[PDB]
Design a protein around this motif. Structure first.
Motif, PDB file in Angstrom:
ATOM      1  N   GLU A  29       1.303  -1.508   0.004  1.00  0.00           N
ATOM      2  CA  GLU A  29       0.035  -0.086  -0.165  1.00  0.00           C
ATOM      3  C   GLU A  29       0.757   1.181  -0.613  1.00  0.00           C
ATOM      4  OE1 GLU A  29      -3.779  -1.554   2.145  1.00  0.00           O
ATOM      5  OE2 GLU A  29      -2.057  -1.174   3.599  1.00  0.00           O
ATOM      6  N   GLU A  30       2.294   0.929   0.158  1.00  0.00           N
ATOM      7  CA  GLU A  30       2.832   2.306   0.169  1.00  0.00           C
ATOM      8  C   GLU A  30       3.475   2.635  -0.448  1.00  0.00           C
ATOM      9  OE1 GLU A  30       6.182   1.425   3.765  1.00  0.00           O
ATOM     10  OE2 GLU A  30       4.906   3.085   5.010  1.00  0.00           O
ATOM     11  N   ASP A  31       4.129   1.887  -1.561  1.00  0.00           N
ATOM     12  CA  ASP A  31       4.264   2.051  -2.443  1.00  0.00           C
ATOM     13  C   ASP A  31       3.088   2.421  -3.966  1.00  0.00           C
ATOM     14  OD1 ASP A  31       7.073   1.697  -2.366  1.00  0.00           O
ATOM     15  OD2 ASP A  31       6.997   0.059  -3.735  1.00  0.00           O
ATOM     16  N   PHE A  32       1.956   2.165  -3.819  1.00  0.00           N
ATOM     17  CA  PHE A  32       0.466   2.281  -4.236  1.00  0.00           C
ATOM     18  C   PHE A  32       0.484   3.914  -3.501  1.00  0.00           C
ATOM     19  CE2 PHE A  32      -4.241   2.467  -4.674  1.00  0.00           C
ATOM     20  CZ  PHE A  32      -4.016   2.569  -5.777  1.00  0.00           C
ATOM     21  N   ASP A  33       0.770   4.188  -2.637  1.00  0.00           N
ATOM     22  CA  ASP A  33       0.383   5.384  -2.587  1.00  0.00           C
ATOM     23  C   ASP A  33       1.128   6.933  -2.769  1.00  0.00           C
ATOM     24  OD1 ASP A  33      -2.747   4.904  -1.160  1.00  0.00           O
ATOM     25  OD2 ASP A  33      -1.466   4.621   0.498  1.00  0.00           O
ATOM     26  N   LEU A  34       2.023   6.408  -3.680  1.00  0.00           N
ATOM     27  CA  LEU A  34       3.123   7.235  -3.652  1.00  0.00           C
ATOM     28  C   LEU A  34       3.074   7.490  -5.079  1.00  0.00           C
ATOM     29  CD1 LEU A  34       6.961   5.770  -2.970  1.00  0.00           C
ATOM     30  CD2 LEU A  34       6.001   7.724  -2.261  1.00  0.00           C
ATOM     31  N   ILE A  35       2.644   5.969  -6.016  1.00  0.00           N
ATOM     32  CA  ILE A  35       1.671   6.551  -7.014  1.00  0.00           C
ATOM     33  C   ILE A  35       0.486   7.402  -7.667  1.00  0.00           C
ATOM     34  CG2 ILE A  35       1.035   5.387  -8.771  1.00  0.00           C
ATOM     35  CD1 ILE A  35       2.007   2.730  -9.415  1.00  0.00           C
ATOM     36  N   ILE A  36       0.164   7.363  -6.701  1.00  0.00           N
ATOM     37  CA  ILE A  36      -1.481   7.806  -6.098  1.00  0.00           C
ATOM     38  C   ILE A  36      -0.692   9.802  -5.977  1.00  0.00           C
ATOM     39  CG2 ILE A  36      -3.810   9.143  -5.168  1.00  0.00           C
ATOM     40  CD1 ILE A  36      -3.162   6.704  -8.002  1.00  0.00           C
ATOM     41  N   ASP A  37       0.078   9.870  -5.051  1.00  0.00           N
ATOM     42  CA  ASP A  37       0.573  10.993  -4.228  1.00  0.00           C
ATOM     43  C   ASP A  37       1.695  11.893  -5.043  1.00  0.00           C
ATOM     44  OD1 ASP A  37      -1.824  10.281  -2.000  1.00  0.00           O
ATOM     45  OD2 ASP A  37      -0.104  10.313  -0.905  1.00  0.00           O
TER      46      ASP A  37
ATOM     47  N   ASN B 180       0.950  16.945 -10.662  1.00  0.00           N
ATOM     48  CA  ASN B 180       0.801  17.776 -12.009  1.00  0.00           C
ATOM     49  C   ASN B 180      -0.781  18.602 -11.356  1.00  0.00           C
ATOM     50  OD1 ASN B 180       1.308  14.500 -12.647  1.00  0.00           O
ATOM     51  ND2 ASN B 180       1.336  16.281 -14.218  1.00  0.00           N
ATOM     52  N   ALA B 181      -0.973  19.858 -11.854  1.00  0.00           N
ATOM     53  CA  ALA B 181      -2.302  20.540 -11.141  1.00  0.00           C
ATOM     54  C   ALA B 181      -3.753  19.752 -11.540  1.00  0.00           C
ATOM     55  CB  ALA B 181      -2.141  21.597 -11.977  1.00  0.00           C
ATOM     56  N   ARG B 182      -4.438  19.894 -10.837  1.00  0.00           N
ATOM     57  CA  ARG B 182      -5.729  20.210 -10.455  1.00  0.00           C
ATOM     58  C   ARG B 182      -6.552  19.655 -12.255  1.00  0.00           C
ATOM     59  NH1 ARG B 182      -5.842  22.321  -5.984  1.00  0.00           N
ATOM     60  NH2 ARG B 182      -6.980  24.162  -7.202  1.00  0.00           N
ATOM     61  N   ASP B 183      -6.279  20.653 -12.638  1.00  0.00           N
ATOM     62  CA  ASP B 183      -7.074  20.913 -14.030  1.00  0.00           C
ATOM     63  C   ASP B 183      -6.329  19.666 -15.328  1.00  0.00           C
ATOM     64  OD1 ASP B 183      -4.431  21.777 -14.726  1.00  0.00           O
ATOM     65  OD2 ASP B 183      -5.402  23.455 -15.904  1.00  0.00           O
ATOM     66  N   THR B 184      -5.274  18.285 -14.668  1.00  0.00           N
ATOM     67  CA  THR B 184      -4.500  17.758 -15.800  1.00  0.00           C
ATOM     68  C   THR B 184      -5.708  17.069 -15.805  1.00  0.00           C
ATOM     69  OG1 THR B 184      -2.727  16.986 -14.015  1.00  0.00           O
ATOM     70  CG2 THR B 184      -2.646  19.071 -15.463  1.00  0.00           C
ATOM     71  N   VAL B 185      -5.313  15.708 -17.189  1.00  0.00           N
ATOM     72  CA  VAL B 185      -5.667  14.373 -17.217  1.00  0.00           C
ATOM     73  C   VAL B 185      -4.665  13.630 -16.498  1.00  0.00           C
ATOM     74  CG1 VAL B 185      -3.713  13.955 -19.164  1.00  0.00           C
ATOM     75  CG2 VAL B 185      -5.882  12.587 -18.653  1.00  0.00           C
ATOM     76  N   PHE B 186      -3.443  13.963 -15.946  1.00  0.00           N
ATOM     77  CA  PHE B 186      -2.887  13.271 -14.955  1.00  0.00           C
ATOM     78  C   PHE B 186      -2.960  13.496 -13.429  1.00  0.00           C
ATOM     79  CE2 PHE B 186      -0.322  14.861 -17.908  1.00  0.00           C
ATOM     80  CZ  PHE B 186       0.375  13.759 -18.509  1.00  0.00           C
ATOM     81  N   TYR B 187      -3.440  14.068 -13.121  1.00  0.00           N
ATOM     82  CA  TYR B 187      -4.225  14.582 -11.673  1.00  0.00           C
ATOM     83  C   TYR B 187      -5.599  13.663 -12.240  1.00  0.00           C
ATOM     84  CZ  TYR B 187      -5.467  16.778  -7.463  1.00  0.00           C
ATOM     85  OH  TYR B 187      -6.171  17.096  -6.313  1.00  0.00           O
ATOM     86  N   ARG B 188      -6.357  14.376 -12.701  1.00  0.00           N
ATOM     87  CA  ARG B 188      -7.906  13.597 -12.537  1.00  0.00           C
ATOM     88  C   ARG B 188      -7.218  11.466 -12.382  1.00  0.00           C
ATOM     89  NH1 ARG B 188     -12.071  17.041 -12.854  1.00  0.00           N
ATOM     90  NH2 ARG B 188     -10.929  19.295 -13.300  1.00  0.00           N
ATOM     91  N   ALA B 189      -6.739  11.113 -13.481  1.00  0.00           N
ATOM     92  CA  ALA B 189      -6.596   9.888 -13.150  1.00  0.00           C
ATOM     93  C   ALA B 189      -5.853   9.611 -11.658  1.00  0.00           C
ATOM     94  CB  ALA B 189      -5.684   9.950 -14.082  1.00  0.00           C
ATOM     95  N   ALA B 190      -4.944  10.317 -11.152  1.00  0.00           N
ATOM     96  CA  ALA B 190      -4.696   9.864  -9.939  1.00  0.00           C
ATOM     97  C   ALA B 190      -5.721   9.488  -8.842  1.00  0.00           C
ATOM     98  CB  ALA B 190      -3.931  10.381  -9.688  1.00  0.00           C
TER      99      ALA B 190
END
Length: 121
Positions: free
Chosen positions: A75-83, A89-99
């Motif tokens: 879980e620590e490694d999964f959360d790193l991916i997201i966090d 990336n900013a809130r308005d990006t496809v990357f952030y939204r994907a996360a």
């Protein structure tokens, strides 16, 4: 020792369950945004921003070496991916939204994985 074998079999079985968890989480990323390490050739400043990069390929390498001792580590490694992604990336990006969508969908999977890890021991 027989005790060391038994412990090794428990680790093998955890690795089996974590492989199934990993597959299920990765299906929640159909764009493959989190499949591989962020390229330092293409994002040369990345390590100035993100101190512990993570991605699904890197997790799979660790998993296959039986390098997760417990679900918390995984879980620590999964959360790193997201966090990492939600900081770079900013809130308005496809990357952030994907996360965000990965986090929300993965929560469901991880919730039952925790029950299974405790339940089967």
């Amino acid at each position: 020792s027989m005790e060391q074998v038994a412990m090794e079999l428990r680790l093998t079985e955890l690795t089996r369950l974590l492989r199934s968890v990993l597959d299920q989480l990765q299906d929640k990323d159909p764009a493959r945004i989190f499949a591989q390490p962020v390229s330092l050739k293409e994002v040369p400043d990345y390590l100035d921003h993100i101190k512990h990069p993570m991605d699904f390929a890197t997790m799979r390498k660790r998993l296959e070496a039986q390098g997760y001792k417990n679900l918390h580590e995984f879980e620590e490694d999964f959360d790193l991916i997201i966090d990492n992604c939600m900081k770079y990336n900013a809130r308005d990006t496809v990357f952030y939204r994907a996360a965000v969508r990965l986090r929300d969908q993965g929560g469901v999977v991880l919730r039952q994985a925790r029950r299974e890890v405790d339940s089967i021991g």
